[PDB]
Symmetry: D2
């Protein structure tokens, strides 16, 4: 019953808090970080207990490497958490197409194609454990206001991933998402720290508590998806 999770976007923000939270909950954890300074940050805390890969989620071999080192260290993979993401800083549709086009390629490369890449790399091992995927979506998957059109459209595509993959991969593999927002002015009156938004990830990964949850997006946004 020893469970193993692999987390992209793990070197900062919600991803770093997920590493802490799944470690605290008993999981073995591997982590994909952008750079060596983030790797040292995890090493100062967990010493050698993690498998850490330093690389770019946009490279598929980096994703294959993360799974390969996970299985080689811990033997199997139970949950893959696709989380690395990037903002568009409210890029307006009026801008020069040269800027729109390059920003689109990066936003969609990281926020959407990387998830396909990470899940393709993780799938053969998730089938042997009948494991699960948890993707990071956004308030921008549901409402306008928190990004430009490129970002909001990339976060909607992730919602389509959840429903399509959950359906294709059931009954064997559960696929879900978490839609955080307003973190680090909401109806709840505060911005949350990344530590406050981790619990939905743990429920959706849990083999006991989430055994019957697939196709589901859990919003955790202070009510931003509602009104302002």
């Amino acid at each position: 019953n020893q469970q193993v999770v692999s987390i992209t976007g793990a070197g900062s923000g919600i991803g770093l808090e997920l590493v802490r939270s799944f470690k605290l909950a008993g999981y073995c954890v591997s982590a994909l970080v952008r750079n060596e300074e983030q790797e040292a940050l995890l090493c100062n805390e967990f010493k050698d207990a993690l498998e850490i890969v330093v690389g770019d989620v946009r490279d598929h071999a980096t994703n294959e490497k993360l799974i390969k080192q996970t299985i080689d260290r811990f033997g199997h993979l139970d949950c893959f958490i696709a989380n690395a993401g990037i903002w568009d800083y409210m890029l307006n549709i009026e801008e020069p197409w040269e800027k729109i086009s390059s920003s689109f390629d990066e936003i969609f490369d990281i926020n959407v194609k990387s998830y396909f890449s990470g899940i393709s790399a993780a799938l053969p091992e998730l089938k042997k454990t009948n494991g699960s995927v948890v993707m990071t979506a956004s308030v921008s998957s549901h409402a306008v206001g928190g990004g430009g059109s490129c970002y909001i459209a990339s976060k909607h595509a992730v919602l389509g991933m959840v429903k399509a993959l959950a359906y294709e991969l059931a009954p064997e593999i559960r696929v879900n998402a978490v839609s955080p927002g307003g973190t680090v002015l909401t109806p709840l009156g505060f911005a949350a720290k990344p530590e406050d938004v981790v619990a939905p990830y743990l429920l959706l990964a849990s083999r006991k508590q989430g055994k019957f949850i697939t196709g589901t997006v859990i919003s955790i946004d202070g009510g931003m998806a509602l009104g302002r």
Copy 2:
């Protein structure tokens, strides 16, 4: 303050009974509204007198007030109200004679919708003192068709409406959320879940730690049923 207190309608059967067992196991003081004396005896055989139990009909406002009043007197405050008592419509067709439709509609909306309003009205002053939360039981019928007739599906969509309107209205003080279970006691995940399997979202949504940033949210737990067959 540490000690948390939760009050649960529809608590003598199905999901509601498992919410009692689950919240008691997590350390809550639990009060519970139950339909009859047999269900009361079920809860006493297991928990003796640790619970506060009211027997009666959730469609009666005074009963909801009684549930709250006993909760406060027995436990002092109220942190979470779970409105969960529900009724089905057994796939009532719209072709049926209006006399039957009219009766079922009154029973479905009184129980699945109006009595959610009544429970929340009765719980509000105490939830404001603790800045607590509400969790409503919605349904897979809140999102997709197939699992009921049109009365049931319309009532479960109305619950989605309450979740959004009340969460907006009561913020920042009170959080309001819902759980949409489905296919309980054939899904894409290949099995029907026991009520014991679907309680974790309620615990998350009531927890002041894990759920402090969640309002207006609806957590589906349906084995993929909303996705389709």
Copy 3:
């Protein structure tokens, strides 16, 4: 191919504009109005060309009477448009339960149970023409801001009606809805007059143009369902 429509809530607002619009488009029209002054208002314009019933949608016999007089005058019924509705004037959940309870009963009696009543009364004739239903929903069926909790919940229930009835009654009868809002400050910068929101009703009723539309809600709200 002569088409016949029956409209509730026809004496004012969108309902009155639907009477004008379907008449202008060639339909025979019957209309349910609240009172005799509204009936005179329609008579001043259309003289005796309509079947007008004066009554309360909450009474089922009034709904049966509207269909009965429609068939007796025009022979058949092609489209039923459930439109009568009522607001809650932002009734807060904090109010005395006595006020909440009575307001709920009226809001749900008119906005939801009346639609079931009108459709039950209209169904046997819609089956013979394989006709259609068009319900009036609201921006409040999708977003908060335009009503109290009772109203917003009643308008969500109508969305559930559309999906349930469309599914139960297909292939024979199409069931759809229109969600108007901000009529008589939106992102489009103006409030619309009821005349501006009628075209979706005509498309969903049209036997040629809407032959393939069922289960559908058409928002016409100046973008209110978006942001503010």
Copy 4:
């Protein structure tokens, strides 16, 4: 001013060709972007030289600029831009070798999403002068599963995202909406629709009279397919 002008991508086949025929019949001046010369000849055999036609690939930004530029030179202004060119993924499975997934993904998102951005970028300055509208072709795959693989469904969900973000961003000047067709050439309505059957929502959404109050909206026209089987 009376005379309206519409520009349509994906115009040589399927729904796009029927949009040409439908808008021409409603009285518009029509320009059209088409994939090859055979489809150009199809449009000329029917309309002679009344149309402005550009042959080329919607994934190339300069082609979109060319479409607009010819529209203005031939007709003076532009009232509506319909981004409609699409491609399927033939139920590509996520188990397939990544080389294949990576290729399909690039082709699907370039055509179904990126080139919508490109067309709208090219049309914007002219739509602002007329305070015109945009209509995008979404899909039943924007709402439900079943009608594609995960790439296709994700791209069609991204279009829903564009509709909401652009309508919010461009208001009050420019309206932005979408049509979600499905099951074209088994549905709850019992038949598959010809492309000729699904054009009315586009006409409504482009009309400055009938659609002046519609933005951020998506009109499903799918025979009930989103409801389920």
